Amino acid sequence: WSSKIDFVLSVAGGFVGLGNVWRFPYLCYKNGGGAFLIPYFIFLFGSGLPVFFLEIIIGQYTSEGGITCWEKICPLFSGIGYASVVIVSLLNVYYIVILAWATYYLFQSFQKELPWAHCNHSWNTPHCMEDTMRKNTNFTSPVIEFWERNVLSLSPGIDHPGSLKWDLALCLLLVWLVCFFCIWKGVRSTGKVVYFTATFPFAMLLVLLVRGLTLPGAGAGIKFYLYPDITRLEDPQVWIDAGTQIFFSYAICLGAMTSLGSYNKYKYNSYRDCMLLGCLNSGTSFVSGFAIFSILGFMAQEQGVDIADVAESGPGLAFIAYPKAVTMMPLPTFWSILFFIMLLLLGLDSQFVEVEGQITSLVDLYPSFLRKGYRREIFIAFVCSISYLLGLTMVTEGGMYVFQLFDYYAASGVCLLWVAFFECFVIAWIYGGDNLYDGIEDMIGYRPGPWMKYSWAVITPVLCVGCFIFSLVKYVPLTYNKTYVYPNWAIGLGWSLALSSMLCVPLVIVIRLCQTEGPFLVRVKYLLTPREPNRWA
Numbered sequence: 001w002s003s004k005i006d007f008v009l010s011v012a013g014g015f016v017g018l019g020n021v022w023r024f025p026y027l028c029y030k031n032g033g034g035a036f037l038i039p040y041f042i043f044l045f046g047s048g049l050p051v052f053f054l055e056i057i058i059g060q061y062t063s064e065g066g067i068t069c070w071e072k073i074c075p076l077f078s079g080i081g082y083a084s085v086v087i088v089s090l091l092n093v094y095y096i097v098i099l100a101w102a103t104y105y106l107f108q109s110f111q112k113e114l115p116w117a118h119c120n121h122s123w124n125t126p127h128c129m130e131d132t133m134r135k136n137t138n139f140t141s142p143v144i145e146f147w148e149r150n151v152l153s154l155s156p157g158i159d160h161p162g163s164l165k166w167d168l169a170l171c172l173l174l175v176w177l178v179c180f181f182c183i184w185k186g187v188r189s190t191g192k193v194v195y196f197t198a199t200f201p202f203a204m205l206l207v208l209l210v211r212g213l214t215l216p217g218a219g220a221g222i223k224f225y226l227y228p229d230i231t232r233l234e235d236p237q238v239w240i241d242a243g244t245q246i247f248f249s250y251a252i253c254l255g256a257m258t259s260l261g262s263y264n265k266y267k268y269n270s271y272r273d274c275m276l277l278g279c280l281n282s283g284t285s286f287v288s289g290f291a292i293f294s295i296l297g298f299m300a301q302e303q304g305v306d307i308a309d310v311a312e313s314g315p316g317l318a319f320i321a322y323p324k325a326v327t328m329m330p331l332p333t334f335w336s337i338l339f340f341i342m343l344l345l346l347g348l349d350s351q352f353v354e355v356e357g358q359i360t361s362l363v364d365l366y367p368s369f370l371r372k373g374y375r376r377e378i379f380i381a382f383v384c385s386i387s388y389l390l391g392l393t394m395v396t397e398g399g400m401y402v403f404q405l406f407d408y409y410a411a412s413g414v415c416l417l418w419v420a421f422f423e424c425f426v427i428a429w430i431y432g433g434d435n436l437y438d439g440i441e442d443m444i445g446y447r448p449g450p451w452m453k454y455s456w457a458v459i460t461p462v463l464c465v466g467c468f469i470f471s472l473v474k475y476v477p478l479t480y481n482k483t484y485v486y487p488n489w490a491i492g493l494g495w496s497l498a499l500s501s502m503l504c505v506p507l508v509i510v511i512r513l514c515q516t517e518g519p520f521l522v523r524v525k526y527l528l529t530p531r532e533p534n535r536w537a
């Protein structure tokens with residue numbers, strides 16, 4: 001009631017999504033259970049929360065979105081905004097594809113028996129034994145066979161596109177139509193409906209966690225998830241994956257948080273409200289990991305296979321562990337329907353915000369003719385179409401590898417670290433930590449501690465440079481389910497996708513330097529001078 005106003009901030013969002021229920025457990029399973037947690041917490045307490053708070057501060061202080069805020073903070077490094085516009089452009093290409101998969105599952109759960117519960121279907125290989133009789137050449141679980149042969153129909157490689165999955169294509173088209181109709185009119189129920197749309201995911205996750213814990217053999221899965229392997233920390237990929245998972249969950253380095261914080265009033269205590277949201281999101285990820293890694297332990301106990309070889313290392317872990325746990329609950333159809341409705345709600349809640357922010361940024365880029373002369377709706381329908389067609393490369397039979405490439409490069413990997421390092425360097429060494437603290441004192445009412453200052457100045461750039469150096473020196477090529485080796489051209493395409501956003505900052509720097517006149521020192525003096533960031537106040 002009276003205190004719910006604070007919870008009203010939590011009603012905004014940013015505490016639950018597909019980056020906690022889907023991406024975090026799959027990344028943890030790929031990079032080992034316990035060894036993934038230490039870099040995750042290091043990036044959470046050293047770079048994640050500081051960068052989130054910094055983006056909120058920039059948005060509130062400059063009262064501008066992703067692009068225009070850097071025009072007042074440091075014009076020379078304005079391309080940091082543009083890179084974000086690229087990243088959010090790539091994410092919307094593939095982040096919605098997951099929904100399609102879930103949508104397909106939501107269409108497969110409307111029958112008497114779940115299709116992923118028996119081997120007696122037409123999409124099952126001859127070597128398919130039910131998990132109950134698994135313990136009595138190699139045998140495959142019916143859930144994995146349903147995921148790989150019916151939902152995906154996986155191809156031998158990325159160079160085998162095959163044909164378009166008509167069911168998956170129809171589901172993706174339906175999801176895109178829903179997004180367009182929810183953006184072309186901006187139909188957000190809010191009211192009391194937001195209560196349900198915010199409490200249902202936690203209600204379902206609590207039941208999932210209870211079911212996972214009650215499953216026999218979950219102790220081994222929990223031990224695998226918690227106890228870290230020290231040697232696995234030597235691989236830089238664990239650190240990169242943890243940092244990029246933190247950034248993906250916090251939606252930072254995309255310009256969305258700056259735009260969201262621009263709505264906040266100048267005299268607003270956002271320091272506490274950003275730490276609360278970050279802690280809630282991290283706790284949600286940590287708790288949701290326990291359910292999946294207990295289901296994995298139960299599956300490993302019942303099948304007899306190892307915990308690390310019982311599911312898919314790559315994407316789709318949430319489509320193997322959760323559907324398997326659903327078949328254990330009484331009346332599995334109802335629980336499967338609820339779980340996939342929750343997944344659809346979370347995905348749509350994230351996608352609406354991301355696509356609307358991208359459209360707003362692109363309209364504000366040049367509204368003279370994009371939204372004034374020409375009808376704005378024409379831009380809404382077109383962009384999604386461009387995002388829809390580019391998604392059809394992940395609808396084909398061999399589209400899972402393309403989705404993995406996008407998930408590893410388009411909105412993760414070195415691009416997010418690059419953007420975070422540039423933001424922190426611009427704020428701490430160009431704008432100045434004390435200069436920003438002076439504004440923060442007026443914005444929130446008190447001077448923050450040295451944690452944010454030393455994270456922006458030292459910790460985050462050091463982490464984002466060490467990650468680059470160690471990932472380049474110890475270069476491990478990307479693999480799918482630790483069995484498939486991508487071709488050289490696929491790796492080149494992924495690196496080109498990363499560079500499409502990485503090169504925005506240097507190109508904008510070059511353009512800005514070239515458009516100016518005079519000796520180089522005069523140009524660098526003009527372009528590094530803030531353009532009255534707090535003119536709005």
Ligand SMILES: [Cl-]
Nearest residue numbers: 020024249285
């Ligand atoms: Cl997370």
